[PDB]
């Protein structure tokens, strides 16, 4: 016989034997997340051990199929995905030490509490703690203390653990024929075999830098506009030509600038769009929100949901002795089982979170016909982009007015549009430079170009160079502040967020141009359009068997990432910021520091 | 009149038809090109279901050739896919029968369905199987009658 037939038979048998185990593991995880009991924990541990044993018995066995003798693309990709060894190349002692360090770091990050200096008995938590403190605060010393104590208490006991973790990851990368952890992360954006659609791990960095070189002026104008009001907000604190403090960005890490909308409002006399009062007066609930989301998603040409989706999902907080996690997550158990776990309340953000979860479910159901080794999206942030392109369309004033949430006597003016554009900008663009700087710093640390005695120095240099934030108190090389983040301490990447932020605008422009829309871009609506729905379904049905370049070319007609959608969307806001800053100063100096006087 | 019955999934219902290919219509039960019969199926999810998996239904998946129309095969040999002789289950040796494991928490296409096929035969023999129409009786009138 031939090797291709044996490989296909082995792949089919592996899928048939792994579908049931994956379904059992998903059911165990669901039972653990719905009810927190010891039996559920034991069942989840047993399912995880069985899945690990299955992955071990399947590995080191399918290596009898060389990749140089396979002519099928799908079979070759599946064999390459199944031949990944992983952490099994290292010894047992090193793996045990790595697992112990991971568990210790997870326990330290999950168990955190800050006590008051004047009263040692007054110890506060984190979320009913510093988060709520930074959410609403009008004091400088309080925020400075909440920042310093946080970065000094939980930022000095994770340095050697993180160093040993980086060393072990570098050893694992060098053992798996890789250079470092950055290469292992960038290996996901690699397409080899198809002529005219190749992609390397070096072109992505060049494209990101080329896009950042054009995004930088907009970020500088936004920072200048924010500082123009921060100077009047806190007198004798903000420098006219200096940087901004790190404990005044809005939160602990300063990733989002949403909390600064109350202080940086252009026109405070105009009312805001709040459909919460209408929903309270009409006595709605989560069921009505889900029905409206379903009616919105079906009007574009998408199939309906299943009965198990409504008879097995938990869309209401029980509020009893049973404890559960209210974090909105999308679950794909398989065999036609899709459930959503979310504590939906009568608010405004939940109306968009429901649409996001419904878009995730639709994406998961799009590639339901693909094999078990192909039931995944073409990219990491692709699901988030598909959810956001629907959430932004559902958050339009026209859609809220057509369903009866807005009064028909509403007069849309220019100030409301400017405020909406600024609110969207402070949320979208306010996290791109920080993400880029953090990813570049992690890549430089994993590569080995930064010495061990200069980590914090290079971190603060990159901060003052890209983000433009100066520290209030200088720190030596004994702190471990960059590792105090959730995504950093749990081995998560950040380029997915930037790719999703680009792809959402790309898909929005594509859908608004395909639907024959006239007028501004922020007034576009994809409601009651079957052509855009069909064009999106033609791409969502691909899944993972096709490269992301072809899927992007079949939608927007381009192979690489672009920034023109964001510029075309923010052109009015950019012009308004330029008109406002014509009589102001643009730029900041890195020599100024709050501890210089 | 012959009655054939089998249990399949909700997605394999379309494979039981004259002129269809796949895995069930080629390795377990194949229909000829011409078949003047009827296909009856219904949902039996609440009947044949059990928690923790119901591993009681099997099917033939791997075979060396295909099945002819109206052919029975209860073989339980070890399928060979390589050039080495079979010396037990292991490399290039897999079991031909697999289990389904139906559960009441599956979707709409992964549920057990009972399909019944009825075949008709007409040869040089008396026909003692017919189908169903009797009215009342009237007297003292010029009417039309039909007595067998």
UniProtKB/Swiss-Prot annotation, chain A:
Tissue/organ expression: Expressed in endothelial cells from small and large arteries, and in arterial smooth muscle cells (at protein level). Expressed in enterocytes of the small intestine, Leydig cells and Sertoli cells (at protein level). Expressed in the renal proximal tubule and the small intestine (at protein level). Expressed in heart, kidney, testis, and gastrointestinal system (at protein level). In lung, expressed at low levels in some alveolar type 2 cells, the expression seems to be individual-specific (at protein level). Expressed in nasal epithelial cells (at protein level).
- Induction entry: Up-regulated in failing heart. Expression is induced by IFNA and IFNG. Exposure to cigarette smoke increases expression in lungs. Expression is decreased in nasal and bronchial epithelium of individuals with allergy after allergen challenge. IL13 stimulation decreases expression in nasal and bronchial epithelium.
> What are the binding positions for chloride in this chain?
151, 459, 463
Q: Mutating residue 13 to D has which effect?
A: Abolishes interaction with SARS-CoV spike glycoprotein
EC number, UniProt record: 3.4.17.23, 3.4.17.-
What keywords appear on the UniProt entry? Carboxypeptidase, Cell membrane, Cell projection, Chloride, Cytoplasm, Disulfide bond, Glycoprotein, Host cell receptor for virus entry, Host-virus interaction, Hydrolase, Isopeptide bond, Membrane, Metal-binding, Metalloprotease, Phosphoprotein, Protease, Receptor, Secreted, Signal, Transmembrane, Transmembrane helix, Ubl conjugation, Zinc
Outcome recorded upon mutating residue 375 to K: Increases very slightly the interaction with RBD domain of SARS-CoV-2 spike protein
Could you give the cofactor binding note from the entry? Answer: Binds 1 zinc ion per subunit.
- Impact noted for substituting residue 174 to D: No effect on interaction with SARS-CoV spike glycoprotein
Record note on what altering residue 327 to A does: Complete loss of enzyme activity
Cofactor(s) this protein requires = Zn(2+); chloride
Q: How is the activity of this protein governed by pH, according to its UniProt record?
A: Optimum pH is 6.5 in the presence of 1 M NaCl. Active from pH 6 to 9.
> What does the annotation give as the result of altering residue 307 to P?
Increases slightly the interaction with RBD domain of SARS-CoV-2 spike protein
Q: How is it used?
A: An engeneered stable, dimeric and secreted receptor with combined mutations that increase the affinity for human coronavirus SARS-CoV-2 spike protein shows potent SARS-CoV and SARS-CoV-2 neutralization in vitro.
User: Does the entry annotate any disulfide bonds, and if so which pairs?
Assistant: 115-123, 326-343, 512-524
The outcome of changing residue 585 to T is: No effect on interaction with SARS-CoV spike glycoprotein
What this protein is reported to do is described as:
Essential counter-regulatory carboxypeptidase of the renin-angiotensin hormone system that is a critical regulator of blood volume, systemic vascular resistance, and thus cardiovascular homeostasis. Converts angiotensin I to angiotensin 1-9, a nine-amino acid peptide with anti-hypertrophic effects in cardiomyocytes, and angiotensin II to angiotensin 1-7, which then acts as a beneficial vasodilator and anti-proliferation agent, counterbalancing the actions of the vasoconstrictor angiotensin II.
Q: What is this protein called?
A: Angiotensin-converting enzyme 2
Curated annotation (Swiss-Prot), chain B:
Reported impact of residue 50 to T: In strain: Omicron/BQ.1.1
**Disulfide-linked positions:** 86-93
Record note on what altering residue 81 to V does: Increased resistance to neutralizing antibodies
Q: Which stretches of sequence are listed as region Integrin-binding motif?
A: 9-11
Region Receptor-binding domain (RBD): what ranges?
Answer: 1-145
Region Immunodominant HLA epitope recognized by the CD8+: list its residue ranges: 54-62
Q: What is this protein called?
A: Spike protein S1
Q: Whom does it interact with, and what assembly results?
A: Binds to host ACE2. RBD also interacts with the N-linked glycan on 'Asn-90' of ACE2. Cleavage of S generates a polybasic C-terminal sequence on S1 that binds to host Neuropilin-1 (NRP1) and Neuropilin-2 (NRP2) receptors. Interacts with host integrin alpha-5/beta-1 (ITGA5:ITGB1) and with ACE2 in complex with integrin alpha-5/beta-1 (ITGA5:ITGB1). May interact via cytoplasmic c-terminus with M protein. May interact (via N-terminus) with host bilirubin and biliverdin, thereby preventing antibody binding to the SARS-CoV-2 spike NTD via an allosteric mechanism.
Q: Which parts of the sequence belong to the BetaCoV S1-CTD domain?
A: 1-132
Ranges where the record places region Receptor-binding motif: 43-113
Organism of derivation = Severe acute respiratory syndrome coronavirus 2 (2019-nCoV)
- Region (Disordered) residue ranges read 61-95, 124-145
Q: What is the effect of changing residue 59 to F?
A: In strain: B.1.1.298
Give the protein's function: Attaches the virion to the cell membrane by interacting with host receptor, initiating the infection. The major receptor is host ACE2. When S2/S2' has been cleaved, binding to the receptor triggers direct fusion at the cell membrane. When S2/S2' has not been cleaved, binding to the receptor results in internalization of the virus by endocytosis using host TFRC and GRM2 and leading to fusion of the virion membrane with the host endosomal membrane. Alternatively, may use NRP1/NRP2 and integrin as entry receptors.
């Amino acid at each position: 016989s031939t090797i291709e037939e044996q490989a296909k038979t082995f792949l089919d048998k592996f899928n048939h034997e792994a579908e049931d185990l994956f379904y059992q593991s998903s059911l165990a995880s669901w039972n653990y997340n719905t009810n927190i009991t010891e039996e559920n924990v034991q069942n989840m541990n047993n399912a995880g051990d069985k899945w690990s044993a299955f992955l071990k018995e399947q590995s080191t066995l399918a290596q009898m199929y060389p990749l140089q003798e396979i002519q099928n693309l799908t079979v070759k990709l599946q064999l390459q995905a199944l031949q990944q060894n992983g952490s099994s190349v290292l010894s047992e002692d090193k793996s045990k030490r790595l697992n112990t360090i991971l568990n210790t770091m997870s326990t330290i990050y999950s168990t955190g509490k800050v006590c008051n200096p004047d009263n040692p008995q007054e110890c506060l938590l984190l979320e009913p703690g510093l988060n709520e403190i930074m959410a609403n605060s009008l004091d400088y010393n309080e925020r400075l203390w909440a920042w310093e104590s946080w970065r000094s208490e939980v930022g000095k006991q994770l340095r050697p653990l993180y160093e040993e973790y980086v060393v072990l990851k570098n050893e694992m990368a060098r053992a798996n024929h890789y250079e470092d952890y950055g290469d292992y992360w960038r290996g996901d954006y690699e397409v080899n075999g198809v002529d005219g659609y190749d992609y390397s791990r070096g072109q992505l960095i060049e494209d990101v830098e080329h896009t950042f070189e054009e995004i930088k002026p907009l970020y500088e104008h936004l920072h200048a506009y924010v500082r123009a009001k921060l100077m009047n907000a806190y007198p004798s604190y903000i420098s006219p030509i200096g940087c901004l403090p790190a404990h005044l960005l809005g939160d602990m890490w300063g990733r989002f600038w949403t909390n600064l909308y109350s202080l940086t409002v252009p026109f405070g006399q105009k009312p805001n769009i709040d459909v919460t009062d209408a929903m309270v007066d009409q006595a709605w609930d989560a069921q009505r929100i889900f029905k409206e989301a379903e009616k919105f998603f079906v009007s574009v040409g998408l199939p309906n949901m299943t009965q198990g989706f409504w008879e097995n999902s938990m869309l209401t907080d029980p509020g009893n002795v049973q404890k559960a996690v209210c974090h909105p997550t999308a679950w794909d158990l398989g065999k036609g089982d899709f459930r959503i776990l979310m504590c939906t309340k009568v608010t405004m953000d939940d109306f968009l979170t429901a649409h996001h979860e419904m878009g995730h479910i639709q994406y998961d159901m799009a590639y339901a016909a693909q094999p078990f080794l192909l039931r995944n999206g073409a990219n990491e942030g692709f699901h988030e982009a598909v959810g956001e392109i629907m959430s932004l369309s559902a958050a339009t004033p026209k859609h809220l007015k057509s369903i009866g949430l807005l009064s028909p006597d509403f007069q849309e003016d220019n100030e409301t549009e400017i405020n909406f554009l600024l609110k969207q900008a402070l949320t979208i663009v306010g996290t791109l430079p920080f993400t880029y700087m953090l990813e570049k710093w992690r890549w430089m640390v994993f590569k080995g170009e930064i010495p061990k005695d200069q980590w914090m120095k290079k971190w603060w240099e990159m901060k003052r160079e890209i983000v433009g934030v100066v520290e209030p108190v200088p720190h030596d090389e004994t702190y471990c502040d960059p590792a105090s983040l959730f995504h950093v301490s749990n081995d998560y990447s950040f380029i997915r967020y930037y790719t999703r932020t680009l792809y959402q605008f790309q898909f929005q422009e594509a859908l608004c141009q395909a639907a024959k829309h006239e007028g501004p871009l922020h007034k576009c609506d994809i409601s009651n359009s079957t052509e855009a729905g069909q064009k999106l379904f033609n791409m969502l049905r691909l899944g993972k068997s096709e490269p992301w370049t072809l899927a992007l070319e079949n939608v927007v007609g381009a192979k690489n990432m672009n920034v023109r959608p964001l510029l075309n969307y923010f052109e009015p806001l950019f012009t308004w910021l330029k008109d406002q800053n014509k009589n102001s100063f643009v730029g900041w100096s890195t020599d100024w520091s709050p501890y210089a006087d | 009149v012959y009655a054939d019955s089998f249990v399949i999934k909700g997605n394999e219902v379309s494979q039981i038809a004259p002129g269809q290919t796949g895995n069930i219509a080629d390795y377990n039960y194949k229909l000829p090109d011409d078949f003047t019969g009827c296909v009856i199926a219904w949902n039996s999810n609440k009947l044949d279901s059990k928690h923790s998996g119901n591993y009681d239904y099997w099917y033939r998946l791997f075979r060396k050739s295909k099945l002819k129309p109206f052919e029975r095969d209860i073989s339980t040999e070890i399928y060979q896919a390589g050039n080495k002789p079979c010396k037990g289950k292991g490399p290039n040796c897999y079991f031909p029968l697999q289990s389904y494991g139906f559960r009441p928490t599956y979707g709409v296409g992964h549920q057990p369905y009972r399909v019944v096929v009825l075949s008709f035969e007409l040869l040089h023999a008396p026909a003692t199987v017919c189908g169903p129409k009797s009215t009342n009786l009237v007297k003292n009138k010029c009417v039309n009658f039909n007595f067998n």
